[PDB]
Amino acid sequence: DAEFRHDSGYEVHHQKLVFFAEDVGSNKGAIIGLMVGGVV
Amino acid sequence: DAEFRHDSGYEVHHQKLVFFAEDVGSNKGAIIGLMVGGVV
Amino acid sequence: DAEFRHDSGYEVHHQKLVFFAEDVGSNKGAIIGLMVGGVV
Amino acid sequence: DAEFRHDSGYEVHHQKLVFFAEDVGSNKGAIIGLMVGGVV
Amino acid sequence: DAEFRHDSGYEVHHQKLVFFAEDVGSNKGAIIGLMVGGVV
Amino acid sequence: DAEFRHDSGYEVHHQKLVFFAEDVGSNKGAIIGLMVGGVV
Amino acid sequence: DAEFRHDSGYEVHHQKLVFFAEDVGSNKGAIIGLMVGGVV
Amino acid sequence: DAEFRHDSGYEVHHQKLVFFAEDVGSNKGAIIGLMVGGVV
Amino acid sequence: DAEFRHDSGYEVHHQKLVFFAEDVGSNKGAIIGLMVGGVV
Amino acid sequence: DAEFRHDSGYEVHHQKLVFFAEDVGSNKGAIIGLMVGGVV
Amino acid sequence: DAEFRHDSGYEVHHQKLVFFAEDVGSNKGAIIGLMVGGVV
Amino acid sequence: DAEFRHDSGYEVHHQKLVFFAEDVGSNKGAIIGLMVGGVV
């Protein structure tokens, strides 16, 4: 879920950088050992 | 869940940088060992 | 959950930097060993 | 949960910096060993 | 939970800096060993 | 839980700085070893 | 680079857990923009 | 590079778990833009 | 770089847990923008 | 760089726990914008 | 850089806990904006 | 940089706890904006 925009007019550089990001690692869930339980 | 915008008009540099981010590590869940319990 | 905006008009530099962020580490959950308990 | 805005008109520098952030470390949960207890 | 705004008109510098933040360390929870107790 | 605003009109400097923050260290919870007790 | 051993003789439980690990996140390198420099 | 061993004799449980691991994320290298530099 | 050993003889429990770890987050390197400099 | 050992003879419990660790957060490097400087 | 040892003979409990650790937060480096300077 | 040892012979308890640690927060470096200066 994301929307990215790059818009420019008159831009002068030698060295310009732009960077976006959200996530690089896990988010949920690795293991379960159980006998009773409701979960999502 | 994110919305990013870069908009510019008259910009002059030698070296310009822009950077966004939210997350790099885990968020939830690594392990469970249980006998009784309701969870999410 | 985030909304980021960069908007500019007349900007002059040699060296300009902008940076945003929220999170880099864990948020919840590493382990449980239990016999009785309701949890979320 | 966050909303960030950068808006400018007439800005002159050699060196300008802007930085935001909320979190870099954990927030909750590392371990539990128990026999009886309700938790969240 | 946060809302950040940077808005400016006529600004002149050589060196200008702005910085916000809330948190860098833990907030809650490292360990428990118990026999009886209700917790959150 | 926070709301930050930076708004300016006619500002002239060589060197201007602004900084906000709330927290850098822990807030609660490191360990418990108990036999009987209700807690939060 | 690792060596793990689990060796046991007479062991009695209902619930026994063992866990090892080293790394879950990055170690090095995300980006570079440069004009002059020796690096590794 | 790893060596793992599980060896057991007389073991009694209802629920026993064993887990090893080293790595789940990147280790090196994402991008470079340069004009001069020795690297590895 | 690690060496882990679990060795036991006569052990009696209901609930026994063992856990090791070194690292979960980054170690080095996120970005550079430079004009002159030797680095590692 | 680490060496961990668990060795035991005659041990009796209901609930025994052991835990080691070194690191969970970053160690070095987030960003640089410079014009002249030697670094490591 | 660490060496951990747990060795025991005749040990009797209901509830025994052992815990080691060194670090959970950052160690060095968040940002730099400079024009001249040697650094490490 | 650390060396930890736990060694015991004849030990009797109901509830015994041992805990070591060095660091939980930052050590160095958050930001710099400068025009001239040698640093480490």
DSSP per-residue letters across L1-23? -EEEEEEEEEEE-SEEEEE----
Tokens of I23: 């690292």
Residue C17 near residue B29 (C-beta atoms within 8 A) = no
Please say whether the beta carbons of C26 and D24 come within 8 A: no
DSSP-derived 3-state class of residue D12? strand
DSSP E36: S
**Closest Cα partner for I25 from D30, K30, G30, C25?**
C25
Angle at G26 between CA G32 and CA J2, to 5 degrees: 125
Contacts of G18 (CB under 8 A, 6+ apart): G6, H17, H18, H19, I6, I17, I18, I19
Q: Is G19 on the interface with B (CB under 8 A)?
A: yes
Q: How would you class H8 by CB atoms within 10 Å of its CB: exposed for 0-12, middle for 13-18, buried for 19 or more?
A: middle
Report the CATH number at residue H27.
Answer: 4.10.230.10
Distance of CA E6 to the CA centre of its chain: 18
K15 touches F at CB < 8 Å: yes
Distance (Å, whole) CA J36 – CA F21: 30
The alpha-carbon gap from J13 to the nearest alpha carbon of chain K, in Å, equals 5
Tell if the CB–CB gap between C3 and D8 is shorter than 8 Å: no
Interchain touch E–B (≥3 Cβ pairs closer than 8 Å): no
Contact F24 L24 (CB under 8 A): no
Q: What share of chain I is helix, strand, coil (3-state, %, to 5)?
A: 0, 45, 55
How many Cα atoms are found within 13 Å in the side-chain-facing hemisphere of L2?
18
Chains touching chain C through at least 3 C-beta pairs below 8 angstroms are: B, D, G, I, J, K
Alpha-carbon distances of I32 from A16, H40, K35, rounded to whole Å: 12, 17, 14
Strand order in the sheet with C3-12: A3-12, B3-12, C3-12, D3-12, E3-12, F3-12
Q: Which residues, in sequence order, are CB contacts of K33 under 8 Å at separation 6+? A: C15, C17, D15, D17, E17, J33, J34, L32, L33, L34
The two structure tokens encoding residue E25: 């360390």
* CB contact at 8 A, I15 and J15: yes
C-alpha distances in angstroms, G29 versus C22, H22, J23?
Answer: 20, 19, 19
Among residues L13, F37, H18, the alpha carbon closest in space to that of D34 is found at F37
The pair phi, psi for residue H3, each rounded to 5°, is -140, 120
Distances (CA, A) of F33 to C33, D10, D29, G15: 15, 61, 16, 20
* Domain assignment of residue E14, given as a range: 1-40
Contact call for L33 and D15, based on CB within 8 A = yes
Closest among F19, C35, K13 to E36, alpha carbons compared: C35
Q: How many CB atoms lie within 10 A of CB L10?
A: 9
Find the closest chain C residue to K24 by CA distance.
C25
Q: H33 is written with which tokens?
A: 């833009």
Kindly determine whether residue B25 and residue G26, on different chains, have CB atoms separated by under 8 Å.
Answer: no
Burial label for H15, CB within 10 Å (0-12, 13-18, 19+), is: middle
In whole angstroms, what is the distance from residue F15 CA to residue E11 CA? Answer: 12
The number of beta carbons lying within 10 Å of the beta carbon of residue C30 is: 24
Burial B1-13 (b: 16+ CB within 10 A, else e): ebebbbebeebeb
Rounded Cα gap, residues D40 and J12, in angstroms:
31
Domain count, chain L: 1
Residue A17 one-letter amino acid: L
Say how many CA atoms lie within 13 Å of K15 toward its Cβ: 15
> Which approach determined this entry?
cryo-EM
Residue B35: closest CA among chain I residues belongs to which residue? I15
**Using CA atoms, how far apart are residues D29 and A20, in angstroms rounded to an integer?**
29
**What backbone torsions phi and psi does residue B21 show, to the nearest 5 degrees?**
180, 160
J19 → chain K, closest CA residue? K19
G25 phi/psi in degrees, rounded to 5: -110, -175
